[PDB]
Design a binder for this molecule. Structure first.
Ligand SMILES: [Zn+2]
Lengths: 119, 86, 71, 100, 52, 50
RNA sequence: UUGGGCCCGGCUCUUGUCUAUGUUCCUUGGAACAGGACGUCACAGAGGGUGAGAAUCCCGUGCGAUGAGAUGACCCGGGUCU
RNA sequence: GCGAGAGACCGAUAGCGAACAAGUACAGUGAUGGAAAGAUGAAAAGAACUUUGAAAAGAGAGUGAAAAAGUACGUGAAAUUG
RNA sequence: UGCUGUAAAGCUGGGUCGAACGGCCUCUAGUGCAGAUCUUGGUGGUAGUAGCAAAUAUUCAAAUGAGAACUUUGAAGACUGAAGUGGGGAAAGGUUCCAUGUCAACAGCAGUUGGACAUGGGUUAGUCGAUCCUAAGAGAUGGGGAAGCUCCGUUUCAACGUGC
RNA sequence: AAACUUUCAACAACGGAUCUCUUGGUUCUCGCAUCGAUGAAGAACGCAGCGAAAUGCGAUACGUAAUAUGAAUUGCAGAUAUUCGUGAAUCAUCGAAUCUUUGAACGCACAUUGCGCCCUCUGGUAUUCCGGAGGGCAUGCCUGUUUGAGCGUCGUUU
């Protein structure tokens, strides 16, 4: 099952880099042993361990960028919403709710009334 | 001598592999693919060739990104992460 | 491949298809701490890249191979 | 091609008509879904009625002078007589027709 | 039945003079389908008579 | 020929790797219908058309 | 005659979880899901599976109950502040 | 396209070309063309072992409800043949 | 195995087989085949027949092997006869290369042999090529046509240096 | 008289009809509105302990994270794998990522794995040469910023 993610996420950047290289040399050691076994299922465990560490390294590095760009007007396009191309071209709620002062006066002056019949 | 004797002189390919569709239909001298129309921006496709659309169209490949558009649409194109249940 | 370890002072490696002789020379310096006299590369009929890395007289290829542990 | 004492027919089927045949298999489904739309709309706005009040008008032409049917909207004069502004009238379920 | 069932072929009759019936046949070569009859209600793989 | 392009040689490498018989332990899997590799190719019989 | 924003509901959507009664007897059969006896449940006797035609063996079905997540200037029912 | 529910529809030469690793194998310089191919058994229990044979196989035996089910597998018609 | 019906057909005895199926009153249709140089599949007679006859030519022994006209080795006899049946390459092929094993299919006889089958191994460049140059030509750009797909033009009615 | 030929029956062949099935098709109905320069559809090449294809994925490669769930996977093997538990398996779910070479495909080019140039860091005694890592350099058009051109033209000073 390999290493466990929540331990990796409590580590710093420099610790993760040390464990990454420590796992990579161990994977290289196994591929040398594969020349003689040749069946060696532990290779599978190490390869997925390298994946987990690389994932934690990336996800930690990405949230540091998110904090750097919180509330800014312009942020990197990979940090923007990725809904669909058409939904990004669509008018925002503020833009779609924009209303001329003439139209605002009419809607306020004549709202849809509530009424009933036969009384 | 237009049969067997002439068939022995076939060693100069008219077509090579196309970069866009990988089909061996790229005309070397014309620099055009007779299959997909490369290097034109549009793909070559005709309404008089309906079986040819079947061979190369959406769904005949991986659909690696369109696979999940329905899944993302069904959840309203969420942002963020899932929460752990209390 | 193992005949080149003794007779040629050469280590034979499988290498990434995209790497050039400059990177392979640097790579063996980091991984096994050994200097390459030359790197001869080759792309195999099965599509992988093979490198022949001959070491300088400072290093013994047989000693290095036992360090790596494939002999 | 022309035989016996039969009526001469005008069957206009010399075009590719088989590509434009519309069979209304969905008549029952359309009826049911139309009722569902009507129910949803009624329930949204209750107790306010679903229909605006329509006037009564004379059908045009010499053939339909006798019949009287539902119009589109009360004229500005008719709303003037009962003292309802047309802008206001549209908000209380009374339909307005500036053209009549 | 499907509107094009039995009609997804480019078959042409070989005509006469080739010692085979004048039914349309599949062209090309290299598959066993080549030279086989097509489009007929009597043919394997053709379309039925008066499709529903 | 001897003088070939890298793109050509990359296609020939894949053509060989696909030209192997079926590994036998796959016949032993439950609900298995494959009896042999039906996409074998001989160099003299069918050309790659590359 | 009358503005706006937030907070909870409702309505719409998605989805999680939970539910009745024989595997009783005899014969045939490799196997009972078959025949016969006695039954039981039924807002469930649709369907599927299980070594042959299974409501009652299993999943479901029917009945609903209760969570969670959305979504809506352009739906309303309320608070609350302006 | 996405997701559902159905039928006096077809039932493997039918129904989509495709119930199968089907737009696959294969053909063509190319545009394009384009198949065939479902079913042991409930369960591989897929025949241990002996014998003849160089071997393939055979004869015994064995498993199985059935080998008049042996993967050249349900039934097994006709042409044709011993 | 018979019976019934003028018939279309129906029913039955025996054998085989293993999961559904019929009668009657109605409904409905992609509903009845001997033919279409019909379609697809299969199988015959012909028939153990035609044939397997170009390229001078093979023979003896040993080994291997269950088995040798055909494999290997030796001895011999031959031929290609340097514009070759020699030794290399370009195009094309794509692992056919080499070793080990092996003979179900293929090598129109055979097969212990093989370009077959199975498992592995194998292609090393500063100097050889590509890469660069321009040729016949192809073809962006600025522009000008064309509803448009695109067409012309190649420095062109251009403010043209990713200058040194 | 045998043989042979022909017919018939039994048995055995050849062959795959018939019969019964059926995770497929076909038609009708209902609901929905969601591809792409934030790089799509498609292609190529790769990736598993033992895989050719199909299916899945991209050098984090039959997958990583997260959420839910709650003991498997299975042809074989094997844990530096797990069981009253941050815990087996799971495209169950899925909101965070990875996403080779390409492709509208975008530095130029492309029958080449060809040729550049800029910035930062780095190795070789180096601002210039060679190598490495990372980040960049398409086109049309729009808004704006900056630097400009033109006796197009305005005011002043000769
Ligand atoms: Zn192409």
């Amino acid at each position: 099952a390999g290493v466990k993610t929540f331990e990796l996420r409590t580590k710093s950047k420099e610790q993760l880099e040390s464990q990454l290289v420590e796992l990579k040399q161990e994977l290289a050691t196994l591929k040398v042993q594969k020349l003689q076994r040749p069946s060696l299922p532990r290779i599978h465990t190490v390869r997925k361990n390298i994946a987990r560490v690389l994932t934690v390294i990336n996800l930690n590095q990405r949230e540091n960028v998110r904090a750097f760009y919180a509330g800014k007007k312009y942020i990197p396009k990979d940090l923007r919403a990725k809904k669909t191309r058409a939904l990004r071209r669509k008018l925002t709620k503020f833009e779609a709710s924009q209303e001329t002062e003439k139209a605002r006066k009419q809607r306020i002056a004549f709202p849809q009334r509530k009424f009933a019949i036969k009384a | 001598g237009k049969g067997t004797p002439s068939l022995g002189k076939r060693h100069n390919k008219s077509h090579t592999l196309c970069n866009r569709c990988g089909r061996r239909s790229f005309h070397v001298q014309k620099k055009t693919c007779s299959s997909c129309g490369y290097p034109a921006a549009k793909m070559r496709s005709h309404n008089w060739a309906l079986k040819a659309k079947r061979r190369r169209t959406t769904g005949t490949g991986r659909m690696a990104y369109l696979k999940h558009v329905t899944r993302r649409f069904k959840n309203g194109f969420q942002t963020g992460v899932a929460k752990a249940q209390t | 491949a193992m005949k080149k370890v003794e007779d040629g002072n050469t280590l034979v490696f499988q290498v990434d298809i995209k790497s050039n002789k400059h990177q392979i020379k640097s790579a063996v310096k980091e991984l096994y701490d050994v200097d390459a006299l030359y790197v001869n590369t080759l792309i195999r009929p099965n599509g992988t890249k093979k490198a022949y890395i001959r070491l300088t007289s400072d290093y013994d290829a047989l000693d290095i191979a036992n360090r790596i542990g494939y002999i | 091609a022309i035989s016996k004492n039969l009526p001469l027919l005008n069957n206009h089927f010399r075009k590719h008509w088989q590509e434009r045949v519309r069979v209304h298999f969905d008549q029952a489904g359309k009826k049911a879904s139309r009722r569902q739309s009507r129910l949803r709309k009624a329930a949204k706005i209750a107790p306010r009625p679903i229909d605006a009040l329509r006037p009564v008008v004379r059908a045009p032409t010499v053939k339909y002078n006798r019949k009287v049917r539902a119009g589109r909207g009360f004229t500005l004069a008719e709303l003037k007589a009962v003292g309802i502004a047309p802008k206001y009238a549209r908000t209380i379920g009374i339909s307005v027709d500036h053209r009549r | 039945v499907a509107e094009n069932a039995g009609h997804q072929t480019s078959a042409e009759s070989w005509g006469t003079g080739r010692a085979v019936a004048r039914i349309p046949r599949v062209g090309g070569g290299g598959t066993h389908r080549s030279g086989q009859a097509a489009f007929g209600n009597m043919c394997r793989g053709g379309r039925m008579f008066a499709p529903t | 020929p001897s003088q070939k392009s890298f793109r050509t040689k990359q296609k020939l490498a894949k053509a060989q790797k696909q030209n192997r018989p079926l590994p036998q332990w796959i016949r032993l899997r439950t609900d298995n219908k494959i009896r042999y590799n039906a996409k074998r190719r001989h160099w003299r019989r069918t050309k790659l058309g590359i």
